[PDB]
């Protein structure tokens, strides 16, 4: 499984079967045939494989990267510090990419799960999507193919000068 908080799902409200007709639908018979002939042998083979997994347990780990000094507190043309700042920035850029991917998966799952009432019932995921796309655009857009922490810091300083001038001219 996964984590239900990073991939949110509302609980399933399925309606009860209330058949009015006297003709039996084939879906019940084919579901019973799929349960007997397919799901049980697949479950048996999976339990065999699961026992063979349990006969030797061993683990893999999620690699933690501790924080190193970023590009703002690295000296100019000091490659030993700004190299590590650049590697940290590139890993953060790839992780922010996958954050945008997670919010896109939330948006698409909400749209398909809500069906025709998607335009009302997925305003929250749309708001989260617009927020994270606006943040990713102000953080990483238009840096070019030779992007760096220097390019991103220069874009941030230009945006902060623009915000400061817009605040100053309106006060």
């Amino acid at each position: 499984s996964w984590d239900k908080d990073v991939y949110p799902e509302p609980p399933r409200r399925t309606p009860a079967p209330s058949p009015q007709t006297s003709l039996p639908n084939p879906i019940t018979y084919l579901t019973k045939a799929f349960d007997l002939l397919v799901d049980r042998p697949v479950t048996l083979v999976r339990e065999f494989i699961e026992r063979q997994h349990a006969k030797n347990k061993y683990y893999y780990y999620h690699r933690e990267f501790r924080r190193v000094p970023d590009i703002t507190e690295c000296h100019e043309k000091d490659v030993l510090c700004m190299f590590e700042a650049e590697m940290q920035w590139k890993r953060d850029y790839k992780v922010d990419q996958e954050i945008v991917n997670i919010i896109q998966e939330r948006l698409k799952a909400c749209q398909q799960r809500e069906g025709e009432s998607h335009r009302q019932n997925c305003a929250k995921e749309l708001q989260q999507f617009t927020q994270v796309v606006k943040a990713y655009q102000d953080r990483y857009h238009d840096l070019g193919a030779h992007y760096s922490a220097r390019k991103c810091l220069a874009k941030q300083k230009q945006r902060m000068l623009a915000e400061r001038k817009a605040t100053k001219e309106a006060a």
């Binding site: 639908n25 879906i27 799929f34 998966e105 948006l107 698409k108 997925c122 796309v133």
Partner: protein
């Protein structure tokens, strides 16, 4: 969930199995056309179960089963969309294709490349069900170019004949002119909506959809043989009769109509695209039915017939009635 998605993927994998059989062969067959016909009859029987349990509840889903490639924010996955359109079109295409192949077991019986013929025809069916069950624009483009290339290989079947090779390259020419607009639409959706998946396209719901819908209308003009890009479909009768019956009447030629039906939430809010589709489909259904009044070759008459019906399908998309258009495809 366990029955629906399983038999959904079983249909497509079952259709891919005789391709592995014809590629992994050594011997002379015990009627490989009978094997492919039995496979497609079994695929129709298999695909009827998800269709019936869609008729029961309206049960739709998406099988995004295999992650393929993440271009920094674009997670292209092998994603099959089981909605109303796939659930209605896959059994109709399988039933028609099963009839076309039992026709072809008699019609193409004197052909010493009959196993190659049934191989190409099954490859067409695999690419078309990739097209109609697709969830993103890249997989739909795979099915799109696949039915274009199998149209090439099946128009130019008797390849020593110069006119068949000429009509096949003509069909490729008009289809790639439509593909200009298809790739234009893909480019617009990636640059302005960061997606090729249809769900994010529908949920973002863009308002400035003049240019991508112009691209999609150009793609449907090329693929469904509308006016300006029409003559490849009467030229396409130069292939064998079951090629014209399966590909060029009922199954391939409705793919541009299917493309504009698939984007109906973007056409039900754009009146300009509706007027363009309406005028273009009316022009096509006038012109092709007028050309059919005086023809003497029977395949040319039925080709202008099916292009006039495609023009009528474009008309009923253009009056913002997409489900009537898809019902008319299945009919």
């Amino acid at each position: 969930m366990n029955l629906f998605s399983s038999l959904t993927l079983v249909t497509l994998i079952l259709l891919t199995m005789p391709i592995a059989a014809i590629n992994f062969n050594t011997h002379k067959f015990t009627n490989y056309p009978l094997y492919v016909k039995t496979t497609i009859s079994c695929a129709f029987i298999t695909s009827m179960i998800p269709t019936m349990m869609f008729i029961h509840t309206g049960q739709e889903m998406i099988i995004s089963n295999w992650h393929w490639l993440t271009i920094q924010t674009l997670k292209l996955s092998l994603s099959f969309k089981m909605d109303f359109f796939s659930m209605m079109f896959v059994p109709v295409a399988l039933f028609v294709t099963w009839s076309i192949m039992e026709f072809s077991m008699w019609y193409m019986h004197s052909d010493p490349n009959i196993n190659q013929f049934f191989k190409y025809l099954l490859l067409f069916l695999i690419t078309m069900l990739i097209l109609v069950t697709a969830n993103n624009l890249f997989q739909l483009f795979i099915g799109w170019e696949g039915v274009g290339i199998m149209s090439f290989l099946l128009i130019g079947w008797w390849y020593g004949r110069t006119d068949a090779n000429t009509a096949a390259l003509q069909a490729i020419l008009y289809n790639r002119i439509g593909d200009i607009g298809f790739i234009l639409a893909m480019a617009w959706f990636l640059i302005n909506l960061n997606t090729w998946d249809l769900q994010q396209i529908f949920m973002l719901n863009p308002n400035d959809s003049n240019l991508p819908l112009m691209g999609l209308i150009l793609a449907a003009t090329g693929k469904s043989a509308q006016f300006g890009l029409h003559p490849w479909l009467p030229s396409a009768m130069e292939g064998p009769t079951p090629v014209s019956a399966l590909l060029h009447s009922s199954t391939m030629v409705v793919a541009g109509i299917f493309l504009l039906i698939r984007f109906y939430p973007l056409t039900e809010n754009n009146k300009f695209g509706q007027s363009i589709m309406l005028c273009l489909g009316a022009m096509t259904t006038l012109f092709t039915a007028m050309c059919a009044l005086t023809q003497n070759d029977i395949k040319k008459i039925i080709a202008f017939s099916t292009s006039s019906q495609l023009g009528l399908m474009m008309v009923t998309i253009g009056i913002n009635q997409p489900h009537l258009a898809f019902l008319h495809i299945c009919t």
